[PDB]
Design a protein around this ligand. Structure first.
Ligand SMILES: Cc1cc2c(cc1C)N(C[C@H](O)[C@H](O)[C@H](O)COP(=O)(O)OP(=O)(O)OC[C@H]1O[C@@H](n3cnc4c(N)ncnc43)[C@H](O)[C@@H]1O)c1[nH]c(=O)[nH]c(=O)c1N2
Ligand SMILES: [Cl-]
Ligand SMILES: [Cl-]
Lengths: 133, 664, 7
């Protein structure tokens, strides 16, 4: 019902190798060629990747900053509120980013700000400005 | 017990055969109970004969050994007994006759050839009361059973192995004739051209592949129906090539997809590195911007402070992104190191692998006495299911003891080459000449002729033996279609043993495919120090043109490379067979050629019935009969096969000319 | 008829 294990014999392939007197040799050749054109394609990309790796020498170590490392404070200073308004203008609803910019405010505190100061700080109007970009 | 008797006679113990059905139509069409009574009687009679084949088993002596109720129906026993006797299932070969032969004979039969098939038929016919004379062209009997005898040296140039005793009629013969049968040790080491052994690992790897390749051709035949190509029957050789080519294709296909997985991944790397390089630039530029914003010293307005803080955050985010991409870079980088370290197989078979495989092909070419490109793909192994059980043996005292023993008491005209066979409604006449002086002519008149000429001879063009009237197309076409192979032997006689004595056979691996069968196997099987070399496949036919000296030279070279140059002495005696050139053989034995089938063997077996002499005269009796290895589909190309064909024709001839009493 | 030297 089936070929022996590891052995491969399909109807389609058999017909191909016996289409003509040289069919077999032609099939094997067209594969020997495909193998060569792929090996040269490998070394080509290997050399292209080697150059790209050399460009990433040092990584991003000279561009790394020390962490903020500070405790979260419940009180809002005028300075902090003003930072938020600008953060809302630049990030919209990315509470995480906004909180990172302010430094000493959690994610929830930011969400609360959006509601607690919605009118006074024209938050709705500031939000539509971000949408225009 | 009785079941072993049926098995030893190639009969189903619990069922009636077609042959039995024909002679006992009353019983087979009757109730199951009666059929069982027949089967027991048959099996028991067989058992009695098999238990002691040195003496004739008479009907009287049979009824004696049977108990009730079986021994009640005397006619049924008598019928079964005669049936077995007539078909040579009992009382065949060389046995002590209890009833001396009646001096008065009935009918006259001329048998062409005194090989095993002819000899077996003669004994039977003589035993039935017929006048029998055999005509042999050679100066000896046995035909293809040819034993070389010089001093203590004994070596078979023809048939040599008894292929299992289980169900083999030769087992009976071996108890009737002193045959020093010796088991063949299966162990066969191989030696490459350079003379160095093949390690157990390879030997097994290639052998397993060999069997796997054959099984593959079977699949290719039965399941894919690849049996005709360009309006030509596909040969086993063609099939093997295609299978091998396809295995080379798979190796190349796996290679391609492996290197394609590498590029795909390497292209994932290309894209990732391009991202990383651009992100590193983004990060560099942003870092500068932060530093510039960081310059503006405190205290500052809120926008300046926002600028610092925002750029700080944006940079942190981008630095996180780069770290995740660098995380992915390390994963792909090692994934590529794993694939590059895991290549698939480089080749399907190396040059050495191919040479060893060619030895297995040569071995198969030896078995079938023909190049694999001539064997029918669909039928080359048609007789497989009939192989005997037990270990293969050799005739240590030379196989010729068999024909010589069978010749005892027979009228054999040696050096008598049959030239013409004339057969008509009233009888036959065979024209033969003296091989020593061809002008001296002989005429033999008879009621029937049993032709046992080898297939090679029947194929001869222009013909060596003329039939008048010519054989009909159905017969000649079979003759043309059937394959008649070739295989030769080189007998090397020495004064001392320089080989491993516990090793019956060892092989030599040829350098090229073309020469695979050239002295590819050596036999060590006799009392005296003798080495027998085989020449199979395409080599057999080509080497017949090469002289003995050159052949022996090549043999010595091979053996030297294996046992050391200063260990192989010059042979004291040498013989080389040339079966194809032999005018009385013209080959070794038949093979199932592409375009042929097991049915041609049946056609070869059919007798010929001449037309009437007088127009409007009743249908004549068959006059021309055929026996011989090439006329038995289940056991062709063997001694047992020949033997059985002879017994078959003797029964048919006797039934025809002496009448059958057991049919009524 | 395959290989021969077997059982
Ligand atoms: C090298 C080799 C190796 C093997 C084998 C053969 C050979 C040649 N075989 C096959 C076996 O030898 C063969 O099947 C039988 O011996 C032949 O039986 P026949 O009676 O059919 O033909 P066979 O050819 O023996 O008889 C025909 C007779 O007709 C005679 N004849 C030819 N022309 C004539 C003419 N014009 N007039 C009168 N007579 C004529 C011939 O001389 C011959 O005597 C074998 N078997 C086996 O069981 N196991 C084995 O090991 C082998 N291996
Ligand atoms: Cl010979
Ligand atoms: Cl017919």
């Amino acid at each position: 019902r089936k070929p022996p294990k590891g052995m491969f014999l399909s109807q389609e392939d058999v017909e191909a190798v016996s289409a003509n007197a040289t069919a077999a040799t032609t099939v094997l050749r067209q594969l020997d060629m495909e193998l060569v054109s792929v090996k040269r394609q490998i070394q080509n990309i290997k050399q292209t990747n080697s150059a790209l790796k050399e460009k990433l020498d040092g990584g991003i170590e000279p561009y790394r900053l020390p962490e903020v490392i500070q405790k979260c404070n419940a009180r809002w200073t005028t300075e902090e509120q003003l930072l938020a308004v600008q953060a809302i203008r630049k990030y919209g609803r990315d509470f995480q980013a906004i909180s990172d910019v302010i430094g000493n405010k959690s994610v929830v505190q930011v969400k609360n700000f959006f509601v607690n100061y919605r009118r006074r700080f024209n938050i709705d109007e500031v939000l539509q400005e971000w949408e225009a970009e | 017990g009785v079941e072993g008797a049926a098995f030893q006679s190639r009969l189903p113990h619990d069922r009636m055969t077609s042959q039995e059905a024909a002679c006992f139509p009353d019983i087979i069409s009757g109730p199951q109970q009666t059929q069982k009574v027949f089967l027991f009687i048959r099996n028991r009679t067989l058992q009695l004969w098999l238990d002691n084949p040195k003496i004739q088993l008479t009907f009287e002596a049979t009824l004696q050994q049977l108990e009730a109720p079986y021994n009640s129906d005397t006619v049924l026993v008598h019928r079964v007994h005669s049936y077995l006797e007539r078909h040579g299932l009992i009382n065949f070969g060389i046995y002590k006759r209890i009833k001396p032969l009646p001096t008065k004979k009935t009918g006259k039969v001329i048998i062409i050839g005194s090989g095993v098939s002819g000899l077996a038929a003669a004994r039977q016919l003589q035993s039935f009361g017929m006048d029998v004379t055999l005509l042999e062209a050679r100066d000896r009997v046995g035909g293809r059973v040819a034993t070389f005898r010089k001093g203590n040296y004994v070596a078979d140039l023809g048939a040599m192995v008894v292929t299992g005793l289980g169900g083999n009629p030769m087992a009976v013969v071996s108890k009737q004739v002193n045959m020093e049968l010796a088991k063949i040790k299966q162990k066969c080491p191989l030696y490459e051209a350079n003379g160095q052994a093949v390690p157990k690992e390879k030997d097994e790897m290639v052998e397993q592949e060999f069997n796997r390749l054959l099984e593959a051709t079977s699949y290719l035949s039965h399941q894919l129906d690849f049996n005709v190509l360009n309006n030509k029957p596909v040969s086993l050789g063609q099939a093997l090539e295609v299978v091998i080519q396809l295995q080379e294709k798979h190796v190349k296909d796996e290679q391609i997809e492996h290197w394609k997985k590498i590029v795909k991944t390497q292209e994932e790397l290309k894209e990732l590195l391009n991202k990383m390089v651009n992100l590193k630039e983004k990060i560099k530029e942003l870092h500068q911007q932060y530093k510039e914003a960081s310059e503006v010293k405190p205290p500052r307005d809120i926008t300046a402070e926002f600028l610092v803080k925002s750029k700080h955050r944006d940079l942190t985010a981008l630095c996180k992104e780069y770290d995740e991409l660098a995380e992915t870079q390390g994963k792909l980088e090692e994934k590529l190191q794993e694939l590059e370290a895991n290549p698939p197989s480089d080749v399907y078979l190396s040059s050495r692998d191919r040479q060893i495989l060619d030895w297995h092909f040569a071995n198969l070419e030896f078995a079938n006495a023909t190049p694999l490109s001539t064997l029918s793909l669909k039928h080359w192994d048609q007789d497989d299911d009939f192989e005997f059980t037990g270990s293969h043996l050799t005739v240590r005292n030379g196989y010729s003891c068999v024909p010589v023993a069978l010749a005892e008491g027979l009228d054999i005209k040696l050096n008598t080459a049959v030239r013409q066979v004339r057969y008509t409604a009233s009888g036959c006449e065979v024209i033969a000449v003296n091989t020593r002086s061809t002008s001296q002519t002989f005429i033999y008149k008879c009621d029937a002729v049993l032709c046992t000429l080898p297939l090679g001879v029947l194929k001869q063009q222009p013909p060596a033996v003329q039939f008048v009237p010519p054989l009909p197309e159905w017969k000649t076409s079979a003759v043309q279609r059937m394959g008649f192979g070739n295989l030769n032997k080189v007998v090397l006689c020495f004064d001392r043993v320089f080989w491993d004595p516990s090793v019956n056979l060892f092989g030599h691996v040829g350098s090229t495919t073309a020469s695979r069968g050239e002295l590819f196997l050596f036999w060590n099987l006799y009392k005296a120090p003798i080495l027998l070399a085989l020449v199979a496949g395409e080599a057999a036919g080509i080497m017949e043109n090469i002289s003995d000296d050159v052949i022996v030279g090549r043999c010595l070279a091979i053996l030297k490379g294996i046992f050391g140059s200063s260990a192989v002495p010059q042979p004291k005696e040498t013989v080389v067979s040339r079966w194809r050139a032999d005018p009385w053989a013209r080959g070794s034995y038949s093979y199932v050629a592409a375009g042929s089938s097991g049915n041609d063997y049946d056609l070869m077996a059919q007798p010929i019935t001449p037309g009437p002499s007088i127009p409007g005269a009743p249908q004549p009796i068959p006059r021309l009969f055929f026996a011989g290895e090439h006329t038995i589909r289940n056991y062709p190309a063997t001694v047992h096969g020949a033997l059985l064909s002879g017994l078959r024709e003797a029964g048919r001839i006797a039934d025809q000319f002496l009448g059958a009493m057991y049919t009524l | 008829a395959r290989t021969k030297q077997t059982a």
